[PDB]
Design an enzyme around this catalytic site. Structure first.
Site, PDB file in Angstrom:
ATOM      1  N   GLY B  11     -23.696  99.054  56.319  1.00 18.17           N
ATOM      2  CA  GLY B  11     -23.457  98.816  57.728  1.00 18.17           C
ATOM      3  C   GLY B  11     -23.874  97.489  58.335  1.00 18.17           C
ATOM      4  N   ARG B  64      -7.790 117.234  52.935  1.00 15.75           N
ATOM      5  CA  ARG B  64      -8.019 116.038  53.734  1.00 15.75           C
ATOM      6  C   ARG B  64      -7.748 116.343  55.202  1.00 15.75           C
ATOM      7  NH1 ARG B  64      -8.361 111.811  50.134  1.00 15.75           N
ATOM      8  NH2 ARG B  64      -8.431 110.327  51.872  1.00 15.75           N
ATOM      9  N   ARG B  90     -12.948 105.694  53.076  1.00 16.33           N
ATOM     10  CA  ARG B  90     -12.116 106.871  52.968  1.00 16.33           C
ATOM     11  C   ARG B  90     -10.807 106.704  53.737  1.00 16.33           C
ATOM     12  NH1 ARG B  90     -12.304 112.444  52.511  1.00 16.33           N
ATOM     13  NH2 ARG B  90     -10.817 113.504  53.887  1.00 16.33           N
ATOM     14  N   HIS B 108     -10.676  94.524  56.927  1.00 17.37           N
ATOM     15  CA  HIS B 108     -10.442  94.482  55.476  1.00 17.37           C
ATOM     16  C   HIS B 108     -10.984  93.167  54.885  1.00 17.37           C
ATOM     17  CE1 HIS B 108      -8.510  95.628  51.733  1.00 17.37           C
ATOM     18  NE2 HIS B 108      -7.958  94.430  51.637  1.00 17.37           N
ATOM     19  N   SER B 135      -9.959  90.210  57.193  1.00 22.92           N
ATOM     20  CA  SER B 135      -8.942  90.456  58.219  1.00 22.92           C
ATOM     21  C   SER B 135      -9.211  91.690  59.072  1.00 22.92           C
ATOM     22  CB  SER B 135      -7.564  90.609  57.580  1.00 22.92           C
ATOM     23  OG  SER B 135      -7.259  89.481  56.783  1.00 22.92           O
ATOM     24  N   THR B 140      -2.927 101.640  60.916  1.00 18.93           N
ATOM     25  CA  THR B 140      -1.648 102.366  60.920  1.00 18.93           C
ATOM     26  C   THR B 140      -1.786 103.111  59.568  1.00 18.93           C
ATOM     27  OG1 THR B 140      -0.555 100.488  62.096  1.00 18.93           O
ATOM     28  CG2 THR B 140       0.912 102.030  60.911  1.00 18.93           C
ATOM     29  N   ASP B 141      -0.918 104.070  59.263  1.00 20.70           N
ATOM     30  CA  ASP B 141      -1.012 104.827  58.009  1.00 20.70           C
ATOM     31  C   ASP B 141      -0.971 103.921  56.767  1.00 20.70           C
ATOM     32  OD1 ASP B 141      -0.745 107.655  59.104  1.00 20.70           O
ATOM     33  OD2 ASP B 141       1.189 106.842  59.820  1.00 20.70           O
ATOM     34  N   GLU B 142      -0.308 102.784  56.893  1.00 24.58           N
ATOM     35  CA  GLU B 142      -0.152 101.876  55.764  1.00 24.58           C
ATOM     36  C   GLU B 142      -1.479 101.176  55.465  1.00 24.58           C
ATOM     37  OE1 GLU B 142       3.588 101.057  56.837  1.00 24.58           O
ATOM     38  OE2 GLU B 142       3.078 102.057  58.748  1.00 24.58           O
ATOM     39  N   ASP B 144      -4.438  99.223  55.045  1.00 29.17           N
ATOM     40  CA  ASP B 144      -4.503  97.783  55.376  1.00 29.17           C
ATOM     41  C   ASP B 144      -3.127  97.146  55.699  1.00 29.17           C
ATOM     42  OD1 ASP B 144      -7.347  97.745  54.811  1.00 29.17           O
ATOM     43  OD2 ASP B 144      -6.777  97.743  52.653  1.00 29.17           O
ATOM     44  N   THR B 171     -20.657  86.892  56.353  1.00 27.04           N
ATOM     45  CA  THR B 171     -21.091  86.067  57.454  1.00 27.04           C
ATOM     46  C   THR B 171     -19.956  85.911  58.452  1.00 27.04           C
ATOM     47  OG1 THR B 171     -22.712  84.885  56.115  1.00 27.04           O
ATOM     48  CG2 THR B 171     -21.897  83.778  58.104  1.00 27.04           C
TER      49      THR B 171
END
Ligand code: NHR
Ligand code: NHR
Ligand code: GAR
Ligand code: GAR
Lengths: 209, 209
Positions: B11, B64, B90, B108, B135, B140-142, B144, B171
């Site tokens: 974290g 899930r 996850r 990401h 990034s 969205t479901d896709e 990344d 950083t």
């Protein structure tokens, strides 16, 4: 500066480009015009201008790859500096897009990213957009996903038919396409990192602002 | 402005966010931190900050869908304005992505679209990249695949280890994530037509340029 134009129909944009070379607004020449439809009147425009013409029928080929290959082979006899799609109703393969990377242009009849694909005017009108237009962009494999170079907006008022707005957009297309080509012809326009750059500066997602 | 952070590990990004709210760079508060790993040190970071914590173990659920469902049920007790994924290892279900559409963020560890998924760093070194980075994007479901909001590039020099570069990217992450969240918190950042918009302006495929 050699330009090769690809068409499928009337070719009004082709004509604007031809006229711009003639006045030298574009410091280059249309060396050839290719079509995937034997009837395309554009061919007749090129014919009357003393410009060479060619026709490649999809039926005479047994695969899209074979088709573009013969297309590349033919287009290249003219050593083009840029390939221009002006109403070309056929999707080009990745190989082809690759072969002309950075020097392949197209003008899509909608304000991209809005309405990629065919039947732009209708959608714009059936969805009730108060604004419609055209977008000139660098061609990538993504159907109208490439870097937008310049758009020309056009107001949409109640009462305007599909043809009314279409003729309105067309008038703009005849203005910005020859212009974008001239920018390219003067080496002022380039594409890298899949982005469009004018005079060395990065252009926004929706083109020169 | 209520923020709910989801984590899986140390974290450090959570901490940067917490510190930004403290200084008011972000005009909001981290109301809660969720983790799918009981051990995540991030939970202790939140604990020490007087912030509520929760843990949801995948084993305690039989699908899930059931898991995210309970996740949504819990996250919502805090009436979040935005859900932030900071190292959440996850994949979230469509229903979950749907429930927080336009208000779900992720960061990401690579320069998207390059290296979607895991092992960013290693692939960067391996594929011999001269530039690596992070990034922040709308989820969205896709995987990344959502609209990139902002990236932070980082140079890669011969002599740099996977840890050297990772710490370098971190950083940057601590710099741009809190920043993007503040944009969101000020109603300056939004997502529609599956695109990212800053100050009313559409952002390029690579994020703010
Ligand atoms: N790789 C690539 N990328 C682009 O962006 C292209 C852009 C264009 C023009 C485009 C227009 O501005 O909008 C455009 C977009 C779609 C179709 C189409 O689906 N045409 C066929 C279907 C496939 C084909 O036969 O080629 C039909 O009869 O519907 C035709 C032109 C043409 C080829 C392209 N090729
Ligand atoms: N729906 C959705 N969409 C995204 O884009 C998401 C993006 C993120 C962060 C992401 C990061 O950028 O890096 C990211 C990338 C990959 C995996 C993964 O494979 N996780 C599991 C796979 C299945 C699971 O979650 O049980 C594993 O154990 O490898 C997890 C997060 C997390 C959840 C997401 N959920
Ligand atoms: N597949 C390309 C495409 O979308 N072409 C579009 O069709 C019209 C034909 O004009 P034209 O008189 O230039 O042929 C133009 O409006 C052009 O944008
Ligand atoms: N699936 C999410 C993901 O890939 N997260 C990435 O993991 C690291 C964890 O940082 P942290 O735990 O110290 O914030 C961060 O670098 C973050 O971008």
């Amino acid at each position: 500066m050699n330009i090769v134009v690809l068409i499928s129909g009337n070719g009004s944009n082709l004509q604007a480009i031809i006229d711009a070379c003639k006045t030298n607004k574009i410091k280059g020449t249309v060396r050839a015009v290719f079509s995937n439809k034997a009837d395309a009147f554009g061919l007749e425009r090129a014919r009357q201008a003393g410009i060479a013409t060619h026709t490649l029928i999809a039926s005479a080929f047994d695969s899209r790859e074979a088709y573009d290959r013969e297309l590349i082979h033919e287009i290249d006899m003219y050593a083009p500096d840029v390939v221009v799609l002006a109403g070309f109703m056929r999707i080009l393969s990745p190989a082809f897009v690759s072969h002309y990377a950075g020097r392949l242009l197209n003008i899509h009849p909608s304000l991209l990213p809005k309405y990629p694909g065919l039947h732009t005017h209708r959608q714009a009108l059936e969805n009730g957009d108060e604004e419609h237009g055209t977008s000139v962009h660098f061609v990538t494999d993504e159907l109208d996903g490439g870097p937008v170079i310049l758009q020309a907006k056009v107001p949409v008022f109640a009462g305007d038919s599909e043809d009314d707005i279409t003729a309105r957009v067309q008038t703009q297309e005849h203005a910005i396409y020859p212009l974008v080509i001239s920018w390219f012809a003067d080496g002022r326009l380039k594409m890298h990192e899949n982005a469009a750059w004018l005079d060395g500066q990065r252009l926004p997602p929706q083109g020169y602002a």
